[PDB]
Amino acid sequence: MVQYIIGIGTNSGFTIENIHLAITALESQQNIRIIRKASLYSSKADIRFLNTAVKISSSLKPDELLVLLKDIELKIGRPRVIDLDILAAEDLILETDKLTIPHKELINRSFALAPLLELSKGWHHPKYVEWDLNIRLKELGEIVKLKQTLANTIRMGIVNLSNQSFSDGNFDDNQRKLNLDELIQSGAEIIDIGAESAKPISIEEEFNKLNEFLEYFKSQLANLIYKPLVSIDTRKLEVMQKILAKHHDIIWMINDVECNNIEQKAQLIAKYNKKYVIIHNYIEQKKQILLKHGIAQQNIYFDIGFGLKALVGHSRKPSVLGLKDSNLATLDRATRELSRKLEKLDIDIIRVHKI
Ligand SMILES: [Mg+2]
């Protein structure tokens, strides 16, 4: 049994998902235990890189572990989708054309070294036992530790484009953009964009608002410290159709509150292989239809619906935080404190305005 620090980076696709999946792959090996996972780090490539590290225990030999990693790199399907490197193994020093441990660039890459030292604050490079790596890390300079984590409970950030959020000024439409930014900085792992509050809205106009914002998102891809997973919040079948046709590459999930056309909707999610949610307003009958039309069960969440993995939407809802003249600075606090409790529980996804 040896301890290895595995470095995991990615700047392509669903970034945090690729990282979670490489970790899942390793944990699933009968001869590997996962000891600890580092924080998530952002560095610049062209899209932003997402890097972390994991400390494992394993009876694998370095070269055999090298073999496993290339395998995993091909499973996740490797702008690199996934890059896996043996960063270190205790005080092990190994030089072979095949591999070097510690990794030759460990001490040149802050996105490698920072997570390592986070996992092993007392670690010294065995080739250079006198090198205080804290000093080196700082010399390497640039590195953003994100508030997004590899926790079990992912936080979905609400981005409403409807009339509720309207404060546009003479020459600026910046509020929803500012809102996306705040959410991403405060650690939302996911973003749920919906364009309806009120007076009904057409398919064409619902589509227009969603499209303009996704195109805006895409134009910002290399400017985001973290590229969140994207959930599309609409109950209209034709909206899904058009939005998925244009933007399926950057969408992770469809979140539909009202069921009509559930048949054609599943047929659409299946073609696109996307996550689906089930809200109230039994879940079984729906599940079966979805399951029927070709929707893999794991790709589907349920929501009980204040108004199979578990999504809960409870943000700024009075009925569930104890009802409602209360200000936003108070509504969030009941959410934020109740969020902090669902995380503790198993909760897979929580939908919130503030993290
Ligand atoms: Mg490599």
Q: What is the CATH number of the domain that holds 257?
A: 3.20.20.20
Q: How far is the CA of 74 from the centre of ligand 1 (A)?
A: 12
295: tokens are: 């929707």
Q: Which of 147, 181, 207 is the last residue of a domain?
A: 147
Contact at 8 Å (CB) between 43 and 144? yes
Q: Is the dihedral of CA 294, 297, 298, 300 positive or negative?
A: positive
First CA to last CA across the chain, in angstroms?
Answer: 40
Same domain, yes or no, for 161 and 126? no
Q: Is the dihedral of CA 73, 75, 80, 83 positive or negative?
A: negative
Same domain, yes or no, for 57 and 106? yes
Instruction: Using the structure block, give the residue that is written with the tokens 């949610």.
Output: 277
Q: How far is the CA of 256 from the centre of ligand 1 (A)?
A: 40
- Which ranges constitute the DSSP H helices of 28-156? 62-75, 110-119, 133-140
For residue 12, give the nearest of 214, 250, 276 by alpha carbon: 250
CATH code of 50's domain:
3.30.70.560
Give CA–CA dist 319/161, Å, rounded. Answer: 24
Strand 49-58 and strand 2-10: the pairing is antiparallel
Q: How far is the CA of 83 from the centre of ligand 1 (A)?
A: 5
Same domain, yes or no, for 17 and 89? yes
Q: Is the dihedral of CA 229, 234, 236, 239 positive or negative?
A: negative
Same domain, yes or no, for 202 and 266? yes
Determine phi and psi for 55, rounding to 5 degrees. -95, 125
Q: How far is the CA of 201 from the centre of ligand 1 (A)?
A: 49
For residue 53, give the nearest of 37, 68, 71 by alpha carbon: 37
Same domain, yes or no, for 64 and 137? yes
Same domain, yes or no, for 110 and 207? no
Q: Is the dihedral of CA 146, 150, 155, 161 positive or negative?
A: positive
Resolution in angstroms for this experimental structure? 2.2
Quick one: 266 exposed, middle or buried, by C-beta within 10 A (0-12, 13-18, 19+)? buried
Q: Is the dihedral of CA 335, 338, 344, 346 positive or negative?
A: negative
Same domain, yes or no, for 85 and 171? no
Give CA–CA dist 195/104, Å, rounded. Answer: 49
Contact at 8 Å (CB) between 33 and 58? yes
Q: Which of 118, 147, 176 is the last residue of a domain?
A: 147
Tell me how far CA of residue 349 lies from CA of 94, 210, 286, 334, in angstroms.
42, 22, 20, 17
Strand 32-37 and strand 49-58: the pairing is antiparallel
Same domain, yes or no, for 121 and 165? no
Same domain, yes or no, for 302 and 177? yes
**Domain span including residue 250:** 148-355
Tell me, what amino acid is at 119?
A: L
- Which ranges constitute the DSSP H helices of the chain? 15-27, 62-75, 110-119, 133-140, 175-185, 203-219, 237-247, 262-272, 283-293, 318-321, 328-342
Q: How far is the CA of 65 from the centre of ligand 1 (A)?
A: 13
Same domain, yes or no, for 154 and 142? no
286: tokens are: 């729906």
The answer, yes or no, to whether the previous bond of 134 is cis (omega within 30 of 0) is no
Q: How far is the CA of 82 from the centre of ligand 1 (A)?
A: 9
191 bridge partner residues:
157, 230
Q: How far is the CA of 214 from the centre of ligand 1 (A)?
A: 32
Same domain, yes or no, for 165 and 175? yes
Q: How many CA atoms lie within 13 A of 316 on its CB side?
A: 12
Q: How far is the CA of 34 from the centre of ligand 1 (A)?
A: 20
Task: Please state how this structure was obtained.
Answer: X-ray
Same domain, yes or no, for 74 and 189? no
Q: How far is the CA of 85 from the centre of ligand 1 (A)?
A: 5
User: What is the total count of domains within the chain?
Assistant: 2
244: tokens are: 């998925």
Q: Which of 147, 170, 199 is the last residue of a domain?
A: 147
Q: How far is the CA of 248 from the centre of ligand 1 (A)?
A: 29
Give CA–CA dist 146/21, Å, rounded. Answer: 19
Q: How far is the CA of 114 from the centre of ligand 1 (A)?
A: 17
